[PDB]
From a paper:
BG18 exhibits the highest potency among the V3/N332gp120 bNAbs described to date. To better understand the molecular mechanism underlying BG18’s interactions with Env glycans and increased potency compared with other V3/N332gp120 bNAbs, we determined the crystal structures of natively glycosylated clade A (BG505) and clade B (B41) Envs in complex with BG18 Fab. We found that BG18 binds the V3/N332gp120 glycan site in a distinct manner relative to PGT121-like bNAbs, primarily through rearrangements in its VH and VL domains. Analysis of BG18 interactions bound to a natively glycosylated Env showed engagement with oligomannose glycans near the base of the V3-loop and the conserved GDIR peptide motif.
We solved the structures of BG18-BG505-35O22, BG18-B41-35O22, and BG18-BG505-IOMA complexes to resolutions of 4.1, 4.9, and 6.7 Å, respectively by molecular replacement using synchrotron radiation datasets. Moreover, the improvement in resolution from 4.1 Å using conventional crystals to 3.8 Å resolution by exposing smaller crystal volumes using an XFEL offers the potential to examine natively glycosylated Env trimer–Fab structures to higher resolutions. In the BG18-BG505-35O22 structures, 17 N-linked glycans were modeled into ordered electron density, forming glycan arrays that extended ~22 Å from the Env surface. The BG18-BG505-35O22, BG18-B41-35O22, and BG18-BG505-IOMA structures each comprised an Env trimer bound to three BG18 Fabs and three 35O22 or IOMA Fabs, with ordered electron density corresponding to native glycans at the Fab interfaces. The orientations of BG18 Fab with respect to gp120 were preserved across the three crystal structures and a low-resolution EM structure of a BG18-BG505 complex, indicating that the orientation was conserved across different Env strains and was not an artifact of crystal packing. Indeed, the observed differences in the orientation of the BG18 Fab light chain on Env influenced the N332gp120 glycan conformation, as the glycan D1 arm reached in close proximity to CDRL2 and the gp120 GDIR motif in the BG18-BG505 complex, which differs from the interactions of the N332gp120 glycan D1 arm with light chain framework region 3 (FWRL3) in the 10-1074-BG505 complex. Despite variability in V1 across HIV-1 Envs, we observed engagement of V1-loop protein components with BG18 CDRL2 and FWRL3 residues, accommodating the V1-loop into the nearby positively charged cleft formed by CDRH3, CDRL1/L2, and FWRL3 loops.
Author numbering:
A (entry chain E): 2 to 211
B (entry chain G): 244 to 306, 309 to 321, 321A, 322 to 398, 410 to 507
C (entry chain D): 1 to 52, 52A, 53 to 72, 72A, 72B, 72C, 72D, 72E, ...
D (entry chain G): 32 to 137
E (entry chain B), F (entry chain B): 520 to 557, 564 to 664
Write the structure that this text describes.
Amino acid sequence: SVLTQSASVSGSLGQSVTISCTGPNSVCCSHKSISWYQWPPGRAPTLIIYEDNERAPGISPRFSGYKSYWSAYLTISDLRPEDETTYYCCSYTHNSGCVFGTGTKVSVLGQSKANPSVTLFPPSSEELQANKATLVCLISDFYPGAVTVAWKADSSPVKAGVETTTPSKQSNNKYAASSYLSLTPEQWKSHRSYSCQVTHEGSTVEKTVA
Amino acid sequence: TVQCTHGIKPVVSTQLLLNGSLAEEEVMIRSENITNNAKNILVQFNTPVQINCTRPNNNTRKSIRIGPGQAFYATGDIIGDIRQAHCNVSKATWNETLGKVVKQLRKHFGNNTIIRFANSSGGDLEVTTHSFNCGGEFFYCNTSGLFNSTWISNSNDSITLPCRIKQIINMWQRIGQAMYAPPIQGVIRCVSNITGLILTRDGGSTNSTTETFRPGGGDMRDNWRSELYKYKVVKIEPLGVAPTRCKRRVVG
Amino acid sequence: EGQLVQSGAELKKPGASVKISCKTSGYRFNFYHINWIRQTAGRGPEWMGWISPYSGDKNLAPAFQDRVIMTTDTEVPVTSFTSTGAAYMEIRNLKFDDTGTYFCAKGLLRDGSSTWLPYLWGQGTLLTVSSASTKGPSVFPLAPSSKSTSGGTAALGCLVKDYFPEPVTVSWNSGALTSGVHTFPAVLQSSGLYSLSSVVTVPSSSLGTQTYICNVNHKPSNTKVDKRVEPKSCD
Amino acid sequence: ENLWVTVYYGVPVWKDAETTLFCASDAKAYETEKHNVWATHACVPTDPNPQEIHLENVTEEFNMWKNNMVEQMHTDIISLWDQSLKPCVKLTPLCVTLQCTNVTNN
Amino acid sequence: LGFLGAAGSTMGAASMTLTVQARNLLSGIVQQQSNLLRHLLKLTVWGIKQLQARVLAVERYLRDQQLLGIWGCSGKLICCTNVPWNSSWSNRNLSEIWDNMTWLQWDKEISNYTQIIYGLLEESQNQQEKNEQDLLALD
Amino acid sequence: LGFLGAAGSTMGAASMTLTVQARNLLSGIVQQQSNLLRHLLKLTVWGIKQLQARVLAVERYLRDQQLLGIWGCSGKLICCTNVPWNSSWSNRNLSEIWDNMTWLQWDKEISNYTQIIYGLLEESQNQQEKNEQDLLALD
Ligand SMILES: *[C@@H]1O[C@H](CO)[C@@H](O[C@@H]2O[C@H](CO)[C@@H](O[C@@H]3O[C@H](CO[C@H]4O[C@H](CO)[C@@H](O)[C@H](O[C@H]5O[C@H](CO)[C@@H](O)[C@H](O)[C@@H]5O)[C@@H]4O)[C@@H](O)[C@H](O[C@H]4O[C@H](CO[C@H]5O[C@H](CO)[C@@H](O)[C@H](O)[C@@H]5O)[C@@H](O)[C@H](O)[C@@H]4O)[C@@H]3O)[C@H](O)[C@H]2NC(C)=O)[C@H](O)[C@H]1NC(C)=O
Ligand SMILES: *[C@@H]1O[C@H](CO)[C@@H](O[C@@H]2O[C@H](CO)[C@@H](O[C@@H]3O[C@H](CO[C@H]4O[C@H](CO[C@H]5O[C@H](CO)[C@@H](O)[C@H](O)[C@@H]5O)[C@@H](O)[C@H](O[C@H]5O[C@H](CO[C@H]6O[C@H](CO)[C@@H](O)[C@H](O)[C@@H]6O)[C@@H](O)[C@H](O)[C@@H]5O)[C@@H]4O)[C@@H](O)[C@H](O)[C@@H]3O)[C@H](O)[C@H]2NC(C)=O)[C@H](O)[C@H]1NC(C)=O
Ligand SMILES: *[C@@H]1O[C@H](CO)[C@@H](O[C@@H]2O[C@H](CO)[C@@H](O[C@@H]3O[C@H](CO[C@H]4O[C@H](CO[C@H]5O[C@H](CO)[C@@H](O)[C@H](O)[C@@H]5O)[C@@H](O)[C@H](O)[C@@H]4O)[C@@H](O)[C@H](O[C@H]4O[C@H](CO)[C@@H](O)[C@H](O)[C@@H]4O)[C@@H]3O)[C@H](O)[C@H]2NC(C)=O)[C@H](O)[C@H]1NC(C)=O
Ligand SMILES: *[C@@H]1O[C@H](CO)[C@@H](O[C@@H]2O[C@H](CO)[C@@H](O[C@@H]3O[C@H](CO[C@H]4O[C@H](CO)[C@@H](O)[C@H](O)[C@@H]4O)[C@@H](O)[C@H](O[C@H]4O[C@H](CO)[C@@H](O)[C@H](O)[C@@H]4O)[C@@H]3O)[C@H](O)[C@H]2NC(C)=O)[C@H](O)[C@H]1NC(C)=O
Ligand SMILES: *[C@@H]1O[C@H](CO)[C@@H](O[C@@H]2O[C@H](CO)[C@@H](O[C@@H]3O[C@H](CO[C@H]4O[C@H](CO)[C@@H](O)[C@H](O)[C@@H]4O)[C@@H](O)[C@H](O[C@H]4O[C@H](CO)[C@@H](O)[C@H](O)[C@@H]4O)[C@@H]3O)[C@H](O)[C@H]2NC(C)=O)[C@H](O)[C@H]1NC(C)=O
Ligand SMILES: *[C@@H]1O[C@H](CO)[C@@H](O[C@@H]2O[C@H](CO)[C@@H](O[C@@H]3O[C@H](CO[C@H]4O[C@H](CO[C@H]5O[C@H](CO)[C@@H](O)[C@H](O)[C@@H]5O)[C@@H](O)[C@H](O)[C@@H]4O)[C@@H](O)[C@H](O)[C@@H]3O)[C@H](O)[C@H]2NC(C)=O)[C@H](O)[C@H]1NC(C)=O
Ligand SMILES: *[C@@H]1O[C@H](CO)[C@@H](O[C@@H]2O[C@H](CO)[C@@H](O[C@@H]3O[C@H](CO[C@H]4O[C@H](CO[C@H]5O[C@H](CO)[C@@H](O)[C@H](O)[C@@H]5O)[C@@H](O)[C@H](O)[C@@H]4O)[C@@H](O)[C@H](O)[C@@H]3O)[C@H](O)[C@H]2NC(C)=O)[C@H](O)[C@H]1NC(C)=O
Ligand SMILES: *[C@@H]1O[C@H](CO)[C@@H](O[C@@H]2O[C@H](CO)[C@@H](O[C@@H]3O[C@H](CO)[C@@H](O)[C@H](O[C@H]4O[C@H](CO)[C@@H](O)[C@H](O)[C@@H]4O)[C@@H]3O)[C@H](O)[C@H]2NC(C)=O)[C@H](O)[C@H]1NC(C)=O
Ligand SMILES: *[C@@H]1O[C@H](CO)[C@@H](O[C@@H]2O[C@H](CO)[C@@H](O[C@@H]3O[C@H](CO)[C@@H](O)[C@H](O)[C@@H]3O)[C@H](O)[C@H]2NC(C)=O)[C@H](O)[C@H]1NC(C)=O
Ligand SMILES: *[C@@H]1O[C@H](CO)[C@@H](O[C@@H]2O[C@H](CO)[C@@H](O[C@@H]3O[C@H](CO)[C@@H](O)[C@H](O)[C@@H]3O)[C@H](O)[C@H]2NC(C)=O)[C@H](O)[C@H]1NC(C)=O
Ligand SMILES: *[C@@H]1O[C@H](CO)[C@@H](O)[C@H](O)[C@H]1NC(C)=O
Ligand SMILES: *[C@@H]1O[C@H](CO)[C@@H](O)[C@H](O)[C@H]1NC(C)=O
């Protein structure tokens, strides 16, 4: 994409944040009108700004903007937690189509840190029939969205059963994630006890069951 | 939004319509409510059939005064052998028109099943026959000869219809005052397209095996509904108010 | 105002080609344009092309104007101001770079300053252009890992391991229970087999009289087996 | 934004209503044979040019059984028929005992 | 174009023409100056329907044209008013209505309080405005 | 307020409202769009009285509204004129009439030469004033 956005920007609650997008003369915004989009990854997107300053119907006046001789901008006022997602932009004329941007990672800081309700999950009686070892764990509402993967298999080091997978944004606008275990039933049954390691800066209250 | 409808002829007809309008697609079927066996059924063709009728009687005019200025016009003495009035229908042309309807009716009545046509069914002698006016004398033709065949599961001969004539009439079930149509002196011949139809019930067969539709032009207003299905009048309201960031001079 | 819903999950081999559909309702399908935009794994959503249901003039991007031809039929009116319609989009020759999520979205306005931009978006369709073959998933119960149930309410769920391709969701018997249940995102093993988990936030009380059957509906495999949780338990 | 109201005279909007219509037809019976029961001695002449506009984008709903143009049609013909019989010879004397016979059974 | 030619088009297009509707509103070729010209009783059913239709013709035209005169807009086809627009009527924005609703739809959106707008219309533009001469007519 | 609500109040009050009388002057709820809607001869005595009353309705409205058009006052409800007031009409003073006579009394005070005022009214405001463009319309 022959366009650049403001990449990663941060902001605090009850405050404002501004994101820039610009490009060269071919896709320039000197004359071409500009539109903006809200886009939760995977989820269905939402339009916010359609004709430069004018905001889409139903959209709160929380959003503003302006267009200059060389770039266009988006002003989000009174940051609430919902704003923490990805935003894009598209340039166009009346008869042409959209030319989308590259992406803008927005993080809303100043939030209260929530303690995740963590639970280990052991294998079932129907899982041993299949001879496939898998063990997971859950975390939710633990903002900021920072994670740490660690497992103990009978106090022995692990490098194959540890699967560091992608975190996801919860529907409650918080974060969530899960880790998985890929092993063979022989090395699996040779270790009967197991421990769960969740490095969450706070009090030493983590569930640990065999 | 035409200012004026098309050319509508007030064809006083019964059971079968004449000189009407037909859309281009295969025959149309209109019901206020299909499946309410009771409500009648209008039928628009795509191509009209030609039916010609003629009265062979040679009526002489006998004017006899009944008081001053007034003169009753009685049937005189007939000239020539007595011949019954008749209607010709191209049997070839009729068989296909009756077929296209059962094809359109297929998708509206129990899909593929048995569709029969019976003679009128009950009623009075003047409403169960194809009544109409022609040249001034009023014909009543036996329709039982047209609604007797039944097809289901996927120079030239010409049908003829017997017709009797009535001179005493009061139409639209109007019991107020009747009129005497004087006999038309000379020869009679009508040649009008037949474009529409009128059908009725199969009694009250609760679900079951098959469906039959017999003619019954019970009312006269449905005849014009065969000409007015596409029209509707509306009231223009030229006054509209809308907002815009525009105001006239400040003081005045 | 009317949910334009996209029918999808259709995915085939690279180069096979496929047609996607989007069912509309709740608006005059006649004169709003309908757009096609996708986001691939390498980010950067790319607009495909716009098309007008009236007249039929379309302008597709030059990067796809040689291999993508989209067409659309007419609509059946419901009222004077609403109608139901549908749009199609045909593509030819594809590779892994063409994998991603695809959206169809209604054109914003009925005017001349700006219409080509979308407004109301479809539910989206996940396309997989992977050379790997179709595999039915494997259902496994979720063990009763002890959790606080003060008030007589506790969470549970059912686990899914090793499936492919495309993700799917978890439902319940006869619906009813949709609020306050949380199934977790899919996972990609280093082996290439996907997996996922579900965790329900409803009163569990004591296991037995309540319903604990989790319902799963799926892909090429479809569904027939919906397993419950095994009874032996702690506390 | 200080949005002000503005008036527009001639707005294309309509609401379903049924008013009284009237007759139209050009040169028909005229001199050779007139006195038609329907067209009377004079109907307002139809314009030789018919005006039809293909209203675009519009999807108005029709109803042919609840339409009142057919009922206006019905009561017009009845009142039109009775007006064409009212001034003529009444045959009240025709009610006497009639002695009748067949004809040429032979 | 044509009579109601833009009835289905956007409100911006009906704003652009508009006269074609206003012109063909009072007189018609259909009326065609009555009389047969070219039995001697014109009491026929046709004459009754025609005359009662010619009356409601000007009765409906003058009922609406009387409204334009009490708003100071008699001489013109589109006049601006000094009545501010009240947000409770519609929440939509300037370019959101003129390019997305069409008039046919719009008349149904205001028909609830349309009479209330008419009441406020006589006041601000002609009850006060025509009165404001008192100070400015002569000092 | 109300129709003729200020008929008995001073002329200054009728000057203040005035529309309520002008509004309910052409159309009425009483007319109520005729027809029974919801025997087939509408030649009844009632239909004759109604239609002849609907005619004189607009016949009297247009006879007075034609007078407003030939005075340059068609678009507005109260317009000023360029005819000087002649003292032979009334000897009373500015605040003496508007606060002490009421309109009902006033119409009887001018009814003698009221037609003469109307004659001079067409002249100064529209016979000369509309003509004065000759020099000013273009030089
Ligand atoms: C009811 O039915 C009607 C049809 O009767 C439907 O009407 C359609 O509505 C759609 C809605 O989008 C229109 O779609 C586009 O309209 C664009 C209009 O742009 C004009 O206005 C903008 C500002 O509003 C201006 O900026 C444009 O350009 C101006 O400024 C330029 C400089 O930047 C100048 O150079 C220029 O001279 C001008 O001053 C412009 O004035 C239009 O651009 C777009 O065009 C696309 O389709 C075209 C189809 O044919 C159009 O163009 C050709 C010439 O190419 C003309 O001859 C035609 O008359 C027609 O205008 C195509 O040619 C172009 O290449 C583009 O692909 C779209 O047209 C439709 O125009 C409009 N219908 C018709 C008949 O075109 C209506 O939608 C429906 N119902 C409802 C309620 O929606
Ligand atoms: C609907 O109903 C109406 C009812 O009115 C029908 O209209 C009627 O039609 C019939 C048809 O038969 C007409 O009858 C005709 O009468 C005229 C006039 O009468 C003169 O001739 C009579 C002759 O006798 C008749 O009957 C004998 C019986 O054998 C026959 O042989 C004979 O041919 C006749 O048909 C005379 O009796 C009558 O008397 C006076 O003149 C006589 C003249 O000489 C006649 O009789 C002698 C014998 O005496 C014969 O030799 C000689 O040849 C001749 O016949 C005279 O002798 C006698 O003394 C008297 O002076 C009249 O002269 C006949 O000319 C016709 O032949 C026929 O009979 C009705 O008149 C007619 N109705 C009216 C209005 O009068 C109508 O037709 C029907 N609908 C249809 C289908 O149209
Ligand atoms: C239904 O019944 C009616 C009533 O009969 C039929 O009407 C008549 O039918 C006949 C036969 O079809 C027609 O043909 C012939 O018309 C000839 C002309 O007569 C008319 O013009 C005459 C002028 O002069 C002509 O006749 C004189 C002799 O008087 C000649 O010298 C001269 O050269 C002309 O030929 C008028 O004088 C006359 O009044 C007529 O206006 C008739 O001459 C001819 O008569 C023969 O047939 C008669 C029986 O019809 C018979 O009585 C005579 O003796 C003679 O043999 C014949 O009438 C008529 O034109 C026709 N009209 C009228 C008013 O009579 C009608 O045809 C029938 N429908 C059917 C199925 O045919
Ligand atoms: C039973 O049905 C058959 C078949 O339709 C009829 O035979 C047709 O009879 C019709 C009318 O009786 C004839 O129809 C028309 O004739 C027109 C005459 O030409 C011009 O001038 C007249 C008089 O001014 C105008 O009224 C007319 O509009 C024309 O300007 C043709 O020109 C017509 O053809 C085409 O144009 C018209 C214009 O709108 C269209 O409406 C037509 O659909 C068409 O496109 C038309 O042909 C016709 O000629 C006869 N033959 C055929 C095969 O149709 C029987 O008369 C009919 N019987 C009855 C009483 O119903
Ligand atoms: C004008 O034309 C009509 C129609 O032709 C005639 O009406 C017919 O008149 C004849 C004679 O009057 C009727 O025939 C009679 O039938 C009698 C028995 O009828 C019964 O059974 C028959 C069937 O077998 C049924 O149709 C009928 O309804 C009855 O149930 C016979 O008995 C008659 O013959 C002789 O004896 C009787 C009784 O004593 C006498 O009255 C007779 O005069 C005769 O001596 C006779 O055959 C016939 O039914 C009537 N209609 C029909 C169906 O044709 C008019 O009579 C005729 N008028 C003139 C003046 O010609
Ligand atoms: C202009 O403003 C007027 C109000 O002044 C609007 O009038 C409304 O018109 C609508 C439609 O004609 C009315 O809807 C009603 O529909 C009834 C059938 O279903 C209704 O009830 C169902 C269940 O009822 C319960 O809940 C409702 C909630 O209000 C209660 O009122 C009941 O008592 C029950 O507790 C609802 O699920 C359903 O949505 C319907 O409300 C029918 O029987 C009624 O005759 C009526 O048609 C509505 O009632 C009217 N207004 C009010 C507030 O009562 C008008 O639409 C406005 N027009 C525009 C276009 O602006
Ligand atoms: C508008 O202007 C017109 C004039 O153009 C005014 O018309 C006057 O109207 C009044 C009332 O209708 C007329 O009054 C008359 O009354 C008669 C009865 O008594 C009259 O006479 C009595 C004695 O008469 C003698 O003196 C008078 C004085 O003028 C002489 O005319 C007689 O010839 C006698 O010599 C008087 O005491 C008494 O006051 C009356 O005058 C009656 O019989 C008449 O038919 C008439 O109604 C008056 O005559 C009219 N004008 C003139 C000058 O004659 C009209 O009122 C003005 N309207 C307004 C409101 O401005
Ligand atoms: C519905 O239509 C069917 C035919 O599709 C019809 O059945 C046919 O009816 C006719 C007339 O009744 C029958 O024809 C008769 O056949 C008998 C022998 O079976 C002959 O004796 C008859 O001849 C006499 O009558 C003829 C006139 O009808 C005279 O022309 C002749 O000289 C004789 O006097 C006559 O030919 C025919 O057999 C049946 N069957 C078939 C298959 O044709 C049925 O009646 C119709 N129903 C109704 C109520 O319309
Ligand atoms: C059309 O766009 C205009 C703005 O150009 C919208 O008008 C403005 O709408 C916002 C909507 O939030 C109003 O904000 C207010 O926020 C407070 C927060 O407490 C809330 O209580 C109010 O109900 C309202 O939401 C803003 O005041 C308003 N401005 C004015 C005076 O018009 C308009 O709403 C948009 N139309 C729609 C709904 O699409
Ligand atoms: C109605 O009565 C009329 C006669 O008054 C019958 O009309 C005639 O029908 C025959 C059918 O073969 C026609 O024959 C052929 O017509 C074609 C043209 O269509 C012609 O090219 C052939 O040379 C041959 O004449 C005949 O023309 C036709 N006459 C006219 C002028 O219409 C008619 O058939 C009767 N209706 C029924 C039920 O058949
Ligand atoms: C609009 O007018 C209504 C009725 O007086 C009132 O309730 C509403 O608050 C007004 N809105 C504004 C602020 O224009
Ligand atoms: C008023 O006009 C009348 C009639 O022309 C005249 O007699 C009278 O003197 C005038 N008064 C003045 C000076 O305005």
